[model samples]
Target: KNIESLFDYSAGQFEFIDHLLTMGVGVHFAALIFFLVVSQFVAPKYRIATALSCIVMVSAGLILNSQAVMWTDAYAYVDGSYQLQDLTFSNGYRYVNWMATIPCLLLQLLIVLNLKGKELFSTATWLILAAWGMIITGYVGQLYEVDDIAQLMIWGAVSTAFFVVMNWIVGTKIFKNRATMLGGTDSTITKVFWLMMFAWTLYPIAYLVPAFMNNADGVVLRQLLFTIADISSKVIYGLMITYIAIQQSAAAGYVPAQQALGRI
Candidate 1:
């Protein structure tokens, strides 16, 4: 009922949330450097994927910092715990990062797989659009989380619908283009896809927590859930994809990647 609105918090609870958001920012910047350093070893053909993933880190890092700041600012310590102030802490800022990040993530996948012509256009068009639908509807749903359960439910449902469509398209395309993904000896992209979906699934659960918990505890729990999703999805996911590019570069005779992979 009154999840995020019930913003009175234990100092420890507030500390945990702020720590995670700060750590998330740190991780993103660290991943950004990793992406660039590894990218130079990758071939030009696959080099841009690392660049795009770098952008994801920058966007996510900045947004996480913003969120942490907003979180700290939105409450002021009182007699015992921190209490809500005039400044609002909105997870809505996250949606902004997700909007920019998810599409690039999907595009990075496609680029890594290197689809061309009709197949590339077809999969990318639908996948990116459905991603937009998922994030935007989810944002709208989150808006009513503190006040209107009906709207939250309605928008959440719609948001989930888009999420389902995006997963469908991505899963099918990854399987369909298994020959192109480069790491597919037997079940490489299978696990990659699994890892991707695992992170994504956390988001809806995070979104729904305020509906159920709606207290100081719920707020902290929700922030932690998002941190899990963010780290897994962006940093871990980007690292894995960069490695895939590294693998492909080795096979394609990029001498630096070849030496790095010990294929020399």
Candidate 2:
């Protein structure tokens, strides 16, 4: 919210945030290149999951760069500390980037699996809508962070409702899918599912940072938490999914994937 960007930050504080944003941009862009190269090792069916991952990386890479630009100019050094300017440098960019990328990120699961027709449509609609709902509600809550605690708390609860719904829907699908997956990939799918849940859980915890600590340290920590969460959720999550795709492709006798995974 505005409060996060409304304080006078020390030079170290400002640089820390700016540097984290830079890290986000670099990691995503780097991951984007890697996803394309890795796609060749999967069966064409599974490769689309990597393609979706590439989209997420591109979107995150661009959005983070955009955020970094704004952040650099949003403060000016005055006296010995950086002074917050009137620029629109809210954490809203995080919400914006997540909205643009999360659906594609989540959809990789839908794309890689063997689900078809009605199940695919139904699952995708519910899962994506629930994710959007979670993002939007959290954005609303965060907007109120500097202005209204009641609204922040209320919208946070609403956001969590969506989170629970999303996890419920995805959890069921993952559990069912795991049971049917070939032995090579099933356990990894479950592990990836848990990995996703762990990474995403950090968001709400970081979102609550302002409620308890709204100082320079809190601001930096929030960004640190978010940066780590973003990497875990998007980059690491995509890599794990891509790993499963390689195994899935191997089981299907794709020579490249089989050879790469040593499934011969």
Candidate 3:
């Protein structure tokens, strides 16, 4: 039998996977920046929770980056020269990072839902729920490999059911503005918010584009979708949190109208 040649220098290039991995790093790093910037504005009691979210964001970055390395190494496994073994480090790190959001969720559930004025849930409440949904999905991914359509369907169904019960207790329909959630808008801030919103629309575009395109079929496409969704969801919220922090911080120590100068 003829001996197989050792190194095919011009072996099949991993151009697509390499590009997708870079995209993953870009998004995760962006998320970390946003989380840290926003964590500065959380109230004292909640500061620790927000700080944990920042840690989660950075940890997620590490997981994704490390995953890229793992994938690259796995590719070399195909050749006889490089042996490989399975490793859970990347996924395990991500699981822990995602779980870190639980404390933040507990606080939101208490302050935004449990103790919301008149039990009237507001726009701010909805935003917080959206944030929690993303966080929970991360844990779901860790627990059940929620990387598939069926898993996502389960996630959406469960999340929707929870919101239904919550809305009922709040005694308002889904669309009612009980707390005037968007009321904190300054013109400049609102414009920036809208701009971020518009930019965020790109994420879904990235997701659906490859989805419909016939040429882009395979694991690579699926990873791209996950990357886009994760990056966009985290990055958008990070910026939103920045706005929330700024507004909340500025409101600190301001006397309420009920507690007037006479009372003071």
Candidate 4:
């Protein structure tokens, strides 16, 4: 089969994948706005945290959109499929954004839950370190192609280990504390925690697609899959946080002080 010929074969699919990226960018922008609106309802103490989370998502949106554009521009017809011209173009910026935003995501959770003291700080620190470890190893494995597959496997395994720590130890354990400390569990907290886990789980699966399926269609699938996962993690996860912050503020009888009205 001619590689160029298959361009038409998979061209429709590629266009659809590109559209997914476009939609992803739009969703992220919408998420930024959503966070800003919800920030108003957040108590003053937590408002800064909420605003910071919004900024993270806004940055993630820009980086994510850039990654998508790079993916579109970086592919060239070659080697029996549309191969990525630059390895980094495929996953580089994606991980760069992930490394930053994933920690912010966790921090948003911890902050909303009001976890403080050395214990809270320690947990946040280790969680971020784990996330950084996960993304960096993943970047190395993907960006470096090898004569032997073992190198890829080694790096992949190392990345997966960090992911396990992030998801199970940090994400799950902290969620449990939310249930316990928040008085016998709450659905809003539970929903956000589990949803974040679910979104994070799709990442490794998307990352593995290139390893198992080496074709142009697979390339398109890879981009689409990542877009879905990114939206779930950043946009939906942010919304979940917004909802909880609002609820907490209302229950505490806290609202943004009206400076214009001479109230504070």
Q: For residues 99-143, what per-residue lDDT tens digits would candidate 1 score against the true structure?
A: 788989998888777777797778888887998998999888888
Pairs of residues at least 3 apart in sequence or in different chains that clash in candidate 2: none
| Residues 1-264 of candidate 4: C-alpha lDDT, one tens digit per residue | 112122332456656766787888788788778677767667775675678667776787787677667757766666454554543344556777777778787887877777778967898888999989999998777654333346656788999999887777655656566753332226677777678778888877766665676566766676777878887877777776766666666555563422211342
Model 4: how far residue 206 lies from native, Å = 1.2
Question: Which order, best to worst by lDDT?
Answer: 2, 1, 4, 3
Kindly indicate the candidate among 2 and 3 with the higher TM-score: 2
How accurate locally is residue 113 in candidate 2, as Cα lDDT from 0 to 100? 65
Off by over 4 Å in 4: 1-10, 75-88, 145-148, 171-176, 179-185, 255-264
lDDT of 4: 0.69
Write model 2 residue lDDT over 21-81, tens digit each, in one string.
9999999999988999889998987788889999998888888888889988888898999
Candidate 1: which stretches are off by over 4 Å?
Answer: 183-186
Better model by TM-score: candidate 2 vs candidate 4:
2
Off by over 4 Å in 3: 1-13, 41-49, 77-216, 252-264
**Candidate 3 lDDT by residue in tens digits, 177-261:** 3243332523323343344344434433432322244232423454565566556445544445444434444455323211332
Query: What lDDT is reached at residue 23 by model 1?
Result: 97
lDDT of 1: 0.84
Q: Please tell me which predicted candidate would have the highest TM-score against the true structure.
A: 2
